[PDB]
Design a protein around this ligand. Structure first.
Ligand SMILES: Nc1nc2c(ncn2[C@H]2C[C@H](O)[C@@H](COP(=O)(O)OP(=O)(O)OP(=O)(O)O)O2)c(=O)[nH]1
Ligand SMILES: [Ca+2]
Ligand SMILES: [Ca+2]
Ligand SMILES: [Ca+2]
Ligand SMILES: [Ca+2]
Ligand SMILES: [Ca+2]
Ligand SMILES: [Ca+2]
Length: 901
DNA sequence: TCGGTAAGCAGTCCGCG
DNA sequence: GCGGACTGCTTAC
C-alpha cells in the first residue's frame, strides 16, 4: 500500500512523525529535516523557482530548522521578504508525501475516552486535579473494545466490582441497559488503588497510543485532568508519557474576556467531539451536555440516576460505571450518524495538514495552496501584518411585509466560490484597476464597460484572463467534491420521500428491508418492491435513507463551508493571501449579480404578463430571489387545477422551461459586461410554495429582512409527501426561544399558511388557556452568558446589566454558601425565567445552567414565583403579533355584526 | 467562546415638553 | 410608551 502520515511534530531540529508504512504497520521516526526558504534574486541568474508574480527566487537550504527560523528573523531585521513555507512540518509533509494521499482508516487508531472524578467540594478543576480519578472508559477503534478501568478503593468510598450481568439487564430488572451490541466488547479491569490504575492506564496507552483522540469535552476536561493528576501523583516525566514523544506544552487559549489552559500532547491529534460537533453540525443548541445532544441526535433517553453526581459512586457504583461506559458509546453513536471523524480525516489528508488543523480554514487553505504552487516550483509569499479593517458584504432587499400566496425562489449555486472562478480572483491574477461608477450604474447596465482586456468586478478590480489563478484552481477541486456529495444527499432525500409515500399503504406481511444504495435514485424495480413492503421494513428503509442523507449532508455542507471559508479568509488578516481588494471584489460582484438579476427577472415577467413596472421579485438575500407567482397561477385560473400537486408541477415546469433560460440569458449578458473569464452564475429554482389547493391558508409571509415563512411543496427537486414549512429567522428557529414556545409558534405558522385565520384563532385561544401547565424547562428562555464578572457589583447588577446576567446574579445569591450547587460557567448557556413582583429572590428573573434541572434548594420557590404572564407576552404573544400583523391576520376574533344573534 | 458581513430582536438607559 | 444609541446575542446568507 501507499504510505501515509498519522501525526507530525517539530521538536527543536527534528521532525517526529508517526506513519503507516508500505506494509500497513504503524511506525515512528525522527528526521533531521533540512528546510528550504527563498529570497528574490537578480533576473540575470538561472533559477527554476519563481514567486507567484513570476519574479525569480534563489533557494536557501538550511543545516537545520532553527537556522531557518533565525534567517527569517534576520531578513525582517534587514527589511526583506523571506519567502516559502515557514511552518516546517507542512513542508516536511509536502516533501515526504508528494502525491494524493490514499489513507486507510482501519489502520488509524481512533480513541474515544471519558473519565469520572468524584468531588464533594464542587467542580473538579483540571488545573488542580486534587481528586482521585475513579473510572476511565477508553474505546480503541482498532481493537473495537471498551477498556474499563475501575477504582474500587478511594478516600471517598470503597465499592464492589461492577457487574456486567446487571449492566446488561433492562432498567425494569434493576439493570443499567448497557446496549447488548457492546456487552461482548467490554474489557473490565478493577483496581484496589488509584496509583495502580494510572500506571496500568499509561502502560496500556503506550501499547495502544491514540492517533486521533476524541470524546466529549476531552480537550478542556479529561485530558488536562488525567495529565495533571498523574503529574501530581508521580511527577512531570510520568505525565509526559501521554505523548509518544514525551513532549507536552501547556497551551493558553485566549478569548475576548479571559483565557483557559489545555495540554498539547505532541504526536497526538486531539479532536474533541464537542468541538467537531460545534464546527460541523450546523446547529446551535440550547445545551451541549452529552445527555442533551445524544437525545437530540439519537432520540435516546437521558441517563437517569438519583442524588447528585458527587454521591453516585458511593450510592450506586454499578450505575456509575455503566453510565461512564454508555457515555463513551453515545459519542461513537453520534459519530456513526454524523461522520465528523471521517470528514476530518478526508479534509486533513487532502490539505496535507495535522488532522487537528481542520478547525482552521486559514491553515487548511494555506496548505492546499502551498502544495499546489510547489507542484509548479512556485514560491509562496511571506505572511505579513495587517490592521483589521471592516469591508462590505452582501445586499439584502427590504421586503414589503405581507402575506404572499404563491412563491417560487431561485438561488445561485455556490455563489462566492463561483464568483472567484468566474472573475478569476487570486493574489497573482490582479491586473490593475478601473474607474468605478456607482453600483446602481452597473446594475442597470448604464456604466461604461470596465475593460476590453481583463475580467472585472464592480469594485474596480481587474484580473488576468489568460490562465486560472491558484485560488480559482484549488477552489474548483473542492467545489467538485462538494457537488458530488450534494448529489448523494439529494438522491437520499428523494428516496426518503418515496418511502414516506409508500408508508401510506403498508402491506400486511412479514419481509425484510431491501438491500439498496440510498445515494442513487431508486430504480423502477425498487419502487415496485417498496409498494409491497410491510410498515416494519419501510420504516427501517426510511431510517437508512435518512442516515444516508445525513452522511451526504455532513460531506457536502462542510465542503461548502471550506470553499466559502476561502472567500472569507481573503478578508482575515492572518491569511497569507489576505487582500481586501480581492475580498471586496467578491462581495461587490455578488451585490451586482443579485440586483442585476432582480431587474432581469422583473423585466421578463412584466413582458410575459403584459404589464410594466410591476415588482415580481419580492425579496432577495445575497444570492437568492423570491418571485411572486400569483399572476402566473391566475393566468391559468385556480379552478383549472386538479389538486395541489397539479399546480406545483405547472410552476415547476414554468420555472425550468421559461424562467431559468431567461435567468441564464441575463447572467450571460452580465458576464460579457464584466468581461469575465467564464460564465458560472448558475441560478436554479429552489422552492415552490403556496397554500393547499382549496384551503384558506395564506401560503407564506415576510415580516422583514431575514424573517419569513413558506409552505413548501418542492425543494430543489424533492417533491415532499407532505408540505414542509420553510421558516427563516423567526423565533421558531432561534435557540434562545423556549422549546414549548418554538413548538407553539410553529403550529401557529402552520395553521396560518395551510389552514387560515380561523384555524390560527382556535389554536391561539387554547395555547393561552393551557400554557401554565407546561414544564418550567420547556418555557425557559436560553442565552449564552458572557462577562458575568463585569456586571457583578457585590453580587448585584451593575450599570447596563443584561437581563440574562441579572438572572445569574440572582441565582448566585440564592445558592451562596452552598459548595455543591451547580455553578454557572462563564461563556456557557443558561436557562432564564422571569419572577413575579415580591418574590424572595429579590429580583425580576433567575437563570441557571442550561440542559439541567434547577437545584432542589430553590426549585420549588422558582416554580411558585415564575411569571407566566410575562413569559407568555414576551416569548409568544409579541412574536405572534409580529407574524400576524405582517400577514394582515388577527390571532383573536374581532367583534362583528353577527355577535347579536 | 481558538478555529467573512448583514441584520434581526431583547434589553438598558434616557430623552421626549 | 416608543425610539435612538448602545450592548448582547443569534440568525441568514
Ligand atoms: N464565509 C462564509 N460565507 C458564507 C457562509 N454562508 C454563506 N456565505 C456566503 C457565501 C455564499 O456563497 C453566499 C450564499 O450563501 P448560500 O447559503 O446560498 O450558499 P452557496 O451559494 O455558497 O451554496 P449553495 O450551492 O447555495 O448551497 O453567502 C459561511 O458560513 N461563511
Ligand atoms: Ca460522567
Ligand atoms: Ca446559493
Ligand atoms: Ca440550488
Ligand atoms: Ca403497499
Ligand atoms: Ca441562498
Ligand atoms: Ca426598542
Amino acid at each position: 500500500m501507499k504510505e501515509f502520515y498519522l501525526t507530525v511534530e517539530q521538536i527543536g531540529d527534528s521532525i517526529f512523525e508517526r506513519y503507516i508504512d508500505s506494509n500497513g504497520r504503524e511506525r515512528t521516526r525522527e528526521v533531521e529535516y533540512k528546510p528550504s526558504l527563498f529570497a528574490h534574486c537578480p533576473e540575470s541568474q538561472a533559477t527554476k523557482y519563481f514567486d507567484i508574480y513570476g519574479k525569480p527566487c534563489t533557494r536557501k537550504l538550511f543545516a537545520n530548522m532553527r537556522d531557518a527560523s533565525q534567517w527569517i528573523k534576520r531578513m525582517e531585521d534587514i527589511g526583506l521578504e523571506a519567502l516559502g513555507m515557514d511552518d516546517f512540518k507542512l513542508a516536511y509533509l509536502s516533501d515526504t508525501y508528494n502525491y494524493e494521499i490514499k489513507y486507510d482508516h482501519t489502520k488509524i487508531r481512533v480513541a474515544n475516552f471519558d473519565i469520572e472524578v468524584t468531588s464533594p467540594d464542587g467542580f473538579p478543576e483540571p488545573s488542580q486535579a486534587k481528586h482521585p480519578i475513579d473510572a476511565i472508559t477508553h474505546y480503541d477503534s482498532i481493537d473495537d473494545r471498551f477498556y474499563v478501568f475501575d477504582l474500587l478503593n478511594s478516600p471517598y468510598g470503597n465499592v464492589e466490582e461492577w457487574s456486567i450481568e446487571i449492566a446488561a439487564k433492562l432498567q425494569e430488572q434493576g439493570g443499567d441497559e448497557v446496549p447488548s451490541e457492546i456487552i461482548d466488547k467490554i474489557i473490565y479491569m478493577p483496581f484496589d488503588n488509584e496509583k495502580e490504575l494510572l500506571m496500568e492506564y499509561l502502560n496500556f496507552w503506550q501499547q495502544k497510543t491514540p492517533v486521533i483522540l476524541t470524546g466529549w469535552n476531552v480537550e478542556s476536561f479529561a485530558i488536562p485532568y488525567v495529565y495533571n493528576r498523574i503529574k501530581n501523583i508521580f511527577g512531570e516525566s510520568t505525565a509526559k508519557r501521554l505523548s509518544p514523544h514525551r513532549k507536552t506544552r501547556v497551551k493558553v487559549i485566549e478569548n475576548m474576556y479571559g483565557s483557559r489552559e489545555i495540554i498539547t500532547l505532541f504526536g497526538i491529534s486531539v479532536l474533541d467531539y464537542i468541538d467537531l460537533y460545534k464546527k460541523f453540525s450546523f446547529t446551535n443548541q440550547p445545551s451541549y451536555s452529552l445527555d442533551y445532544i445524544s437525545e437530540f441526535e439519537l432520540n435516546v433517553g437521558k441517563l437517569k440516576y438519583d442524588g447528585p453526581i458527587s454521591k453516585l459512586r458511593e450510592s450506586n457504583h454499578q450505575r456509575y460505571i455503566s453510565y461512564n461506559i454508555i457515555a463513551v458509546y453515545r459519542v461513537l453513536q453520534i459519530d456513526a450518524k454524523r461522520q465528523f471523524i471521517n470528514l476530518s480525516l478526508d479534509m486533513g489528508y487532502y490539505a496535507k495538514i495535522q488532522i487537528q488543523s481542520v478547525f482552521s480554514p486559514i491553515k487548511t487553505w494555506d496548505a492546499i495552496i502551498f502544495n499546489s504552487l510547489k507542484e509548479q516550483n512556485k514560491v509562496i509569499p511571506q505572511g505579513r501584518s495587517h490592521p483589521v479593517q471592516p469591508y462590505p458584504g452582501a445586499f439584502v432587499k427590504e421586503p414589503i411585509p405581507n402575506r404572499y400566496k404563491y412563491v417560487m425562489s431561485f438561488d445561485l449555486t455556490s455563489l462566492y466560490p463561483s464568483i472567484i472562478r468566474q472573475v478569476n480572483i487570486s493574489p497573482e491574477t490582479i491586473a490593475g484597476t478601473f474607474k468605478v461608477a456607482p453600483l446602481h450604474d452597473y446594475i442597470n447596465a448604464v456604466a461604461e464597460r470596465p475593460s476590453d482586456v481583463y475580467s472585472c468586478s464592480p469594485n474596480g478590480m481587474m484580473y488576468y484572463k489568460d490562465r486560472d489563478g491558484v485560488v480559482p484552481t484549488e477552489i474548483t477541486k473542492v467545489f467538485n467534491q462538494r457537488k458530488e456529495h450534494k448529489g448523494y444527499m439529494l438522491a437520499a432525500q428523494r428516496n426518503g420521500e418515496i418511502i414516506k409515500e409508500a408508508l401510506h399503504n403498508p402491506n400486511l406481511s412479514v419481509d425484510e428491508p431491501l438491500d439498496v444504495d440510498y445515494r442513487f435514485d431508486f430504480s423502477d424495480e425498487i419502487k415496485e418492491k417498496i409498494k409491497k413492503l410491510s410498515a416494519k421494513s419501510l420504516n427501517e428503509m426510511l431510517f437508512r435513507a435518512q442516515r444516508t442523507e445525513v452522511a451526504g449532508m455532513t460531506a457536502q455542507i462542510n465542503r461548502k463551508a471550506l470553499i466559502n471559508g476561502l472567500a472569507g479568509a481573503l478578508g482575515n488578516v492572518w491569511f497569507r493571501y489576505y487582500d481586501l481588494r480581492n475580498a471586496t471584489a467578491i462581495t461587490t460582484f455578488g451585490q451586482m449579480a443579485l440586483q442585476w438579476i432582480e431587474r432581469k427577472v422583473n423585466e421578463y415577467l412584466n413582458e410575459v404578463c403584459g404589464t410594466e413596472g410591476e415588482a415580481f421579485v419580492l425579496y432577495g438575500d445575497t444570492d437568492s430571489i423570491y418571485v411572486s407567482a400569483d399572476k402566473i397561477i391566475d393566468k391559468v385560473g385556480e379552478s383549472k387545477f386538479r389538486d395541489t400537486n397539479h399546480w406545483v408541477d405547472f410552476l415547476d415546469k414554468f420555472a425550468r422551461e421559461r424562467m431559468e433560460p431567461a435567468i441564464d440569458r441575463g447572467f450571460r449578458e452580465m458576464c460579457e459586461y464584466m468581461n469575465n473569464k467564464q460564465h458560472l452564475m448558475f441560478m436554479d429554482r429552489e422552492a415552490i410554495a403556496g397554500p393547499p389547493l382549496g384551503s384558506k391558508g395564506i401560503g407564506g409571509f415576510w415580516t422583514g429582512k431575514k424573517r419569513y415563512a413558506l409552505n413548501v411543496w418542492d425543494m430543489e427537486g424533492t417533491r415532499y409527501a407532505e408540505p414542509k414549512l420553510k421558516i427563516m429567522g423567526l423565533e421558531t428557529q432561534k435557540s434562545s426561544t423556549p422549546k414549548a414556545v418554538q413548538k407553539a409558534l410553529k403550529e401557529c405558522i402552520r395553521r396560518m399558511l395551510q389552514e387560515g385565520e380561523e384555524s390560527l384563532q382556535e389554536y391561539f385561544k387554547e395555547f393561552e388557556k393551557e400554557f401554565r401547565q407546561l414544564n418550567y424547562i420547556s418555557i425557559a428562555s436560553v442565552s449564552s452568558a458572557n462577562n458575568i464578572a463585569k456586571y457583578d457589583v457585590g453580587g448585584f447588577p451593575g450599570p447596563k446589566c443584561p437581563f440574562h446576567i441579572r438572572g445569574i446574579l440572582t441565582y448566585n445569591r440564592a445558592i451562596k454558601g452552598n459548595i455543591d450547587a451547580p455553578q454557572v460557567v462563564e461563556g456557557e448557556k443558561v436557562y432564564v425565567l422571569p419572577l413575579r413582583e415580591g418574590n424572595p429572590f429579590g429580583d425580576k428573573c433567575i437563570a441557571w445552567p442550561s440542559g439541567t434541572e434547577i437545584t432542589d434548594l430553590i426549585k420549588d420557590d422558582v416554580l411558585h414565583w415564575m411569571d407566566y404572564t410575562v413569559l407568555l407576552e414576551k416569548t409568544f404573544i409579541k412574536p405572534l403579533e409580529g407574524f400576524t400583523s405582517a400577514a394582515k391576520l388577527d390571532y383573536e376574533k374581532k367583534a362583528s355584526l353577527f355577535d347579536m344573534f
